[PDB]
Ligand binder design. Structure first.
Ligand SMILES: [Mg+2]
Ligand SMILES: [Mg+2]
Ligand SMILES: [Mg+2]
Ligand SMILES: [Mg+2]
Ligand SMILES: [Mg+2]
Ligand SMILES: [Mg+2]
Ligand SMILES: [Mg+2]
Ligand SMILES: [Mg+2]
Ligand SMILES: [Mg+2]
Ligand SMILES: [Mg+2]
Ligand SMILES: [Mg+2]
Ligand SMILES: [Mg+2]
Ligand SMILES: [Mg+2]
Ligand SMILES: [Mg+2]
Ligand SMILES: [Mg+2]
Ligand SMILES: [Mg+2]
Ligand SMILES: [Mg+2]
Ligand SMILES: [Mg+2]
Ligand SMILES: [Mg+2]
Ligand SMILES: [Mg+2]
Ligand SMILES: [Mg+2]
Ligand SMILES: [Mg+2]
Ligand SMILES: [Mg+2]
Lengths: 206, 145, 55, 80, 67, 70, 60, 63, 143, 141
RNA sequence: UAAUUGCGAUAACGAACGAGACCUUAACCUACUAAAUAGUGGUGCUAGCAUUUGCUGGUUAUCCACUUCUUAGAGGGACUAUCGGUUUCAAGCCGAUGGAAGUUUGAGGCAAUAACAGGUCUGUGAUGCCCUUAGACGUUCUGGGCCGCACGCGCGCUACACUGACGGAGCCAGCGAGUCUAACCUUGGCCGAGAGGUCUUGGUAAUCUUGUGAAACUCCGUCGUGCUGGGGAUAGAGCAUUGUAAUUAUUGCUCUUCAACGAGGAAUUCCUAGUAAGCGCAAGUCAUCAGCUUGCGUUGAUUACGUCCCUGCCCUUUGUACACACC
């Protein structure tokens, strides 16, 4: 990998993969593909970033929020509850830990199981509050291709956020155990539960 | 440190000073369940008896304990500053004492009825079951009477 | 005096919580004649060929 | 003594600087002039005195227990 | 949401009304034209005045327009 | 103050053979098995690293991740 | 920048509207290389009402 | 589970009482040159894609 | 190659200075570090309790070296942190003044800081002579 | 006197002053090596300019930066911009323009405030609540 | 369109106040003017480790050059520009590129006509009238009260913890202020656990206090889910400070006491980008007293980028016997 050394020591650890296939701090940004037809063009990978901390204006325009590294928009969605409003450094640290995991168990690269975690936590259909006249029923609606992920990330965090309350298990493990169940949702992730129930009532109007 | 495993040295519960103590909690935090003992008044005496706090309560073989109390029941003869205790100049003998868990409930009343017997306004306050430190009483402390 | 303050019963939060609050405590603003503000109560008016001499 | 002395300098075309005319009406109304007459006089004076615009407001009570307020303005006047 | 004031719009038409030989379709050229052809009071003001004249003169080379 | 938060002489045996079959580990994972409290569990973590028990893929304090001896 | 933040109402009624006032000061120093008779040459027509003039002596 | 291929061709406008919804005519990327004008919940732009459960259904403006 | 203090990581370096100075012996502790909480703004005293003076004397020097001169006051403010005044909002206050005032004297008598002119205390020259030596010793960790 | 330049990087309040000498590839911010700045997680945020532009590009240069003002994160974002603008400044004077036009291109293809100084700025609070746009709570009798 | 802001339609044509302009502040200048009260490079003088010449400092002027950083003067710069999409292809709008900047560029400042029995005679030696005026409603002096406590309401502060408290350690701002007939801001050396004491000095200030080493925050540990070490009310005993005076405890520190509080019913507040929220700081106040306010920077989201459903207010139309105008 044609190493280069000079006056200030540049550890080979950072010198081994810089211009090599761009990876995360420890994970490949290549090979992470969206496994859902929709949400494509709305899950920003390719391009890569080694650490999720970017001072980029994403709200001065309506949709610029979509071209933002999705894993980063997941991180900042943790520094909430006042208690964590700001604290992005504490958050980003939890993510590196969380993505060191599930890898521990799930061989698959974490930035892959994360896109798999948001794919199956998007409420394809939902309900609304029709005017209807007085005692209104609900109307079957289909969420947008970005409120889909917005709701997906918000669902995942809030679920893991409450799990870490009053218990020894770390916020990192809850988010990790939430994303594994969310990789392909199987009966436990707070996120898939709330989604299917926000969808099973979308059929209660038809 | 490193992992340690004694055979039967650890005892779950053992009373002393007329008070109980959980053995499964650290001993620089267990001992503070007594009255007149604090997270700091404890820390000071702990290594003064050359005892290592890193381990729990069922530990600390009794010899140490037998005089661990003596150091607090006799806190000035055993090198502890007299600005670190709850009772200095007492009220009538100028000595400096530490009151710990049975005399504290008593000594509280000692001074309490002293101001009462003296008619001091703050004694009056106490007798009325009110705030004595002059804090506003119209909007605060309402339903716990 | 102070001996009177202690000996005298009827004082203390006990001798007081025992009673009930006068419902007047839970009272309201008792709007201060604010619905009659636009109507002059002076019972007097200003003549018109008095103001034409003033203004 | 000597550290300061003051000299009197008449003000050029007093009818452009407000303070001059403000005091002018004060002494006009105080001499019994009609409110409208005295006010209108200083306005036409200030205009023929050079000013691009003028305005004068009189507030308070004039023989009427209720306080009134009249405005008198001529020409151009910017406010923002 | 910045519709230009008619103060600048009234000025832009009044100059294209008498300076078409001059007043090229470029802003910068038109900008340095006002400092010499107009008596505007501020950069920003003349900037929208000249910036507008340009849009008007850019459209006249497409067709006619009111004013 | 509950459930064996100290040495637990016959529990010391349990932790010896419980370390295999585990793809994850942390101070939480220790108390998560009817076991020792986090305070004694915390320093026991690398007391295993002394000889071929774990794989410290983790980095620092407040979060630890070891892995099966390879 | 000398700032003065004060409520506009003389009383304490109405919306609690504040008002910050400003006074800006400018002080400029110049080190010269002049003679002992121009000391009072640029001393009198040096002024314009409003500028406080201050001349200093050597560095000690 | 039968799903649908739907790409929005163009957008109509914001229906619904509070305005949080909007009618949108889409095109099926399966058997194209299609319809239906279904509605969504989140904010959308053109060229988007989304899955619908029952394609044999379409509701008009919401009250 | 030629190292400097700046060329070493702050925490794994002063902690190396701690083990070194702890195992050296010339301390001259005022004898009262059994109790002091190190600041009014602190709830309890440090947890080392055999040490933490060398750990404080570790960075008490590191800082003085990188700067021209320093004084007792500045150190109090540096380590001094926020104090939870119970139900009142948190506020910052300086640390203890003597635990600093004579953590210097305890180490200037050992000759690693000089009472610099202009007021303050500058890094000593022999203290500047053990600048890289201790720094180097820590580079030996990843040799 | 050797070929050298000066540049800067400005975050919300932090300002980073970088001097680029013609040396043997030394980079020590404030006198301390870049190897470890302090925000260990944010470390790569300043390492990337080197990794993006090809990492050697240093054999005949020497950079050292100082940072006044700012905060624990305001300064880290200003130095990276300061050094990136610095290296392009060097390529303007002493090297050709194509090797420079390729560098500003390799930057702007990934640039996160790397060369264009982020213009964001703290908004001033207005009376009626402790906060820029936040207002105090209302009562409604 | 933020705008009676324009387009367009047009018995109206062309204008003024108000909106805009404007003014201030925050953002762009390696282009101009240069500054030991701002700073950079070289060089002396000077110190450490490594040597191979290097790396990191010291140096109230040792000299030399400069203005990138700093500062504040003069200019310039943006005009929604270019291209495109949308549209009476009109005002405009929207996307992309460029750009310091493209949400009235962000934030303010100012702000017409009218309206109120809105608040202010407790700011005014602004005032009309009335009251009182020597046993005074004048005035000062002594002490007490505005804090008084069965409760009801409102603006807040600290929490219920493990995105934590604690302990070491890393350790970064910005808006301000500040002592002459003087006692203001205070570095530094000691004594003191602390609070604090004490001995000197800089400073009328970009010069000294100060890089305000602030706090959250980052790191390494102890703690282990249990009112627990979360929490810090109440309370006792002691040491300080302010002050003529601290009792009803001015404030600070120390030990001990260790409440309620395990995420809050019905209800309702603030808010769209460096904003919210978390964080501390200065300033006002001030002898002492911030849980207040006014400014500041520090760390930094979510979700909007829409509608008139709720609520409020405008604007038409319309009825009106109201015009003191639905009080
Ligand atoms: Mg206790
Ligand atoms: Mg001219
Ligand atoms: Mg600190
Ligand atoms: Mg600290
Ligand atoms: Mg607190
Ligand atoms: Mg606060
Ligand atoms: Mg300059
Ligand atoms: Mg762009
Ligand atoms: Mg009234
Ligand atoms: Mg008045
Ligand atoms: Mg009196
Ligand atoms: Mg009051
Ligand atoms: Mg209020
Ligand atoms: Mg801490
Ligand atoms: Mg003492
Ligand atoms: Mg002096
Ligand atoms: Mg407890
Ligand atoms: Mg506590
Ligand atoms: Mg809540
Ligand atoms: Mg104050
Ligand atoms: Mg106040
Ligand atoms: Mg009519
Ligand atoms: Mg009615």
């Amino acid at each position: 990998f044609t190493p280069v050394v000079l006056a200030t020591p540049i550890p080979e650890e950072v010198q081994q993969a810089q211009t090599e296939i761009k990876l995360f701090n420890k994970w490949s940004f290549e090979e992470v593909e969206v496994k859902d037809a929709s949400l494509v063009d709305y899950v920003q990978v390719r391009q890569p970033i080694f650490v999720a901390h970017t001072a980029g204006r994403y709200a001065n325009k309506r949709f610029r929020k979509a071209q933002c590294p999705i894993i980063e928009r997941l991180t900042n969605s943790l520094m909430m509850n006042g208690r964590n409003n700001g604290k992005k450094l504490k958050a980003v640290r939890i993510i590196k830990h969380t993505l060191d995991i599930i890898n521990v168990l799930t061989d698959q690269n974490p930035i892959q199981v994360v896109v798999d975690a948001i794919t199956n936590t998007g409420p394809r259909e939902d309900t609304t509050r029709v005017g209807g006249g007085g005692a209104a029923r609900r109307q079957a609606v289909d969420v947008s291709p970005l409120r889909r992920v917005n709701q997906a990330i918000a669902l995942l965090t809030i679920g893991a956020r409450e799990a870490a309350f009053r218990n020894i298990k770390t916020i990192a493990e809850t988010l990790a155990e939430e994303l594994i169940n969310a990789a392909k949702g199987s009966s436990t992730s707070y996120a898939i539960k709330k989604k299917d129930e926000l969808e099973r009532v979308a059929k209660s109007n038809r | 440190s490193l992992v340690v495993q004694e055979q039967g040295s650890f005892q779950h519960i053992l009373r002393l000073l007329n008070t109980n103590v959980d053995g499964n909690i650290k001993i620089v935090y267990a001992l503070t369940t007594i009255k007149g003992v604090g997270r700091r008044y404890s820390n000071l005496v702990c290594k003064k008896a050359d005892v290592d706090l890193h381990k729990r309560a069922g530990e600390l073989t009794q010899e140490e304990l037998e005089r661990i109390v003596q150091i607090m029941q006799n806190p000035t003869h055993y090198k502890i500053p007299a600005w670190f205790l709850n009772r200095q100049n007492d009220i009538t003998d100028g000595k400096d004492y530490h009151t710990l868990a049975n005399n504290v409930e008593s000594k509280l009343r000692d001074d309490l009825e002293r101001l009462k017997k003296i008619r001091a306004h703050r004694g009056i306050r106490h007798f009325w079951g009110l705030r004595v430190r002059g804090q506003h009483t119209k909007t605060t402390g309402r339903r716990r009477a | 005096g102070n001996e009177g303050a202690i000996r005298d019963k009827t004082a203390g939060r006990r001798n007081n919580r025992s009673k009930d609050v006068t419902d007047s405590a839970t009272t309201k603003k008792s709007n201060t004649r604010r619905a009659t503000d636009r109507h002059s109560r002076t019972g007097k008016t200003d003549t018109k060929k008095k103001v034409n001499q003033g203004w | 003594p000597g550290t300061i002395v003051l000299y009197a300098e008449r003000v050029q075309d007093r009818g452009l600087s407000a303070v001059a005319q403000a005091e002018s009406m004060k002494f006009k109304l105080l001499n019994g002039l009609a409110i409208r007459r005295a006010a209108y006089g200083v306005v036409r004076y200030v205009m023929e005195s050079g000013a691009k615009g003028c305005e004068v407001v009189v507030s308070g009570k004039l023989r009427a227990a209720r306080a009134k307020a009249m405005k008198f303005a001529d020409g151009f006047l910017i406010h923002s | 949401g910045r519709v230009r004031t008619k103060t600048v719009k009234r000025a832009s038409k009044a100059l294209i009304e008498r300076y078409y030989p001059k007043l090229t379709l470029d802003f910068q050229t038109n900008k340095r034209l006002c400092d010499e052809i107009a008596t505007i009071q501020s950069k920003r003001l003349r900037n929208k005045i000249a910036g507008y004249t340009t849009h008007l003169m850019k459209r006249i080379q497409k067709g006619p327009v009111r004013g | 103050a509950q459930h064996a938060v100290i040495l637990d002489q016959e529990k010391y045996d349990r932790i010896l053979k419980e370390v295999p079959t585990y793809r994850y580990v942390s101070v939480s994972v220790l108390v998560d098995r009817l076991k020792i409290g986090g305070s004694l569990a915390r320093i026991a973590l690398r007391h295993l690293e002394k000889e071929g028990i774990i794989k410290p893929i983790s980095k620092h304090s407040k979060q630890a991740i070891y892995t099966r001896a390879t | 920048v000398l700032k003065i933040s004060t409520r506009k109402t003389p009383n304490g009624e109405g919306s609690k509207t504040w008002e910050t006032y400003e006074m800006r000061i400018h002080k400029r120093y110049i080190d010269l290389e002049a003679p002992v008779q121009i000391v009072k040459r640029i001393t009198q027509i040096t002024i314009e009402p409003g500028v406080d003039v201050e001349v200093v002596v050597a560095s000690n | 589970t039968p799903v649908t291929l739907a790409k929005v061709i163009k957008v109509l406008g914001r229906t619904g009482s509070r305005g949080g919804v909007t009618q949108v005519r889409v095109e099926f990327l399966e058997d194209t040159s299609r319809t239906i004008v279904r509605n969504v919940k989140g904010p959308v732009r053109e060229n988007d894609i989304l899955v619908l459960m029952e394609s044999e259904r379409e509701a008009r403006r919401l009250r | 190659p030629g190292v400097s203090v700046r060329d070493v990581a702050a925490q794994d370096f002063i902690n190396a200075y701690a083990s070194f100075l702890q195992r050296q012996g010339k301390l001259e502790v005022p004898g009262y570090v059994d109790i002091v909480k190190t600041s009014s703004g602190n709830e309890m005293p440090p947890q080392d309790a055999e040490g933490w003076f060398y750990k404080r004397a570790a960075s008490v020097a590191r800082h003085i070296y990188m700067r021209k001169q320093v004084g007792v006051g500045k150190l109090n403010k540096l380590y001094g942190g926020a104090k939870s005044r119970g139900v009142r909002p948190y506020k910052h206050i300086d640390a203890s003044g003597s635990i600093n005032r004579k953590v210097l004297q305890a180490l200037e008598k050992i000759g690693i800081v000089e009472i610099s002119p202009k007021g303050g205390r500058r890094i000593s020259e022999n203290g500047q002579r053990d600048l890289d030596r201790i720094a180097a010793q820590t580079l030996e960790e990843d040799e | 006197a050797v070929p050298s330049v000066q540049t800067f990087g400005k975050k919300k309040s932090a300002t980073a002053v970088a001097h680029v000498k013609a040396g043997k590839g030394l980079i020590k911010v404030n006198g301390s090596p870049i190897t470890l700045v302090e925000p260990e997680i944010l470390r790569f945020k300043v390492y990337e300019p080197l990794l993006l532009v090809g990492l050697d590009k240093f054999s005949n240069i020497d950079i050292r930066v100082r940072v006044t003002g700012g905060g624990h994160v305001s300064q880290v974002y200003a130095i990276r911009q300061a050094i990136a603008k610095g290296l392009v400044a060097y390529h303007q004077k002493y090297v050709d323009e194509q090797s420079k036009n390729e560098l500003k291109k390799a930057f702007t293809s990934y640039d996160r405030t790397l060369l264009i100084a982020d213009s964001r700025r703290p908004e001033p609070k207005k009376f009626g609540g402790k906060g820029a746009r936040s207002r105090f709570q209302k009562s409604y009798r």
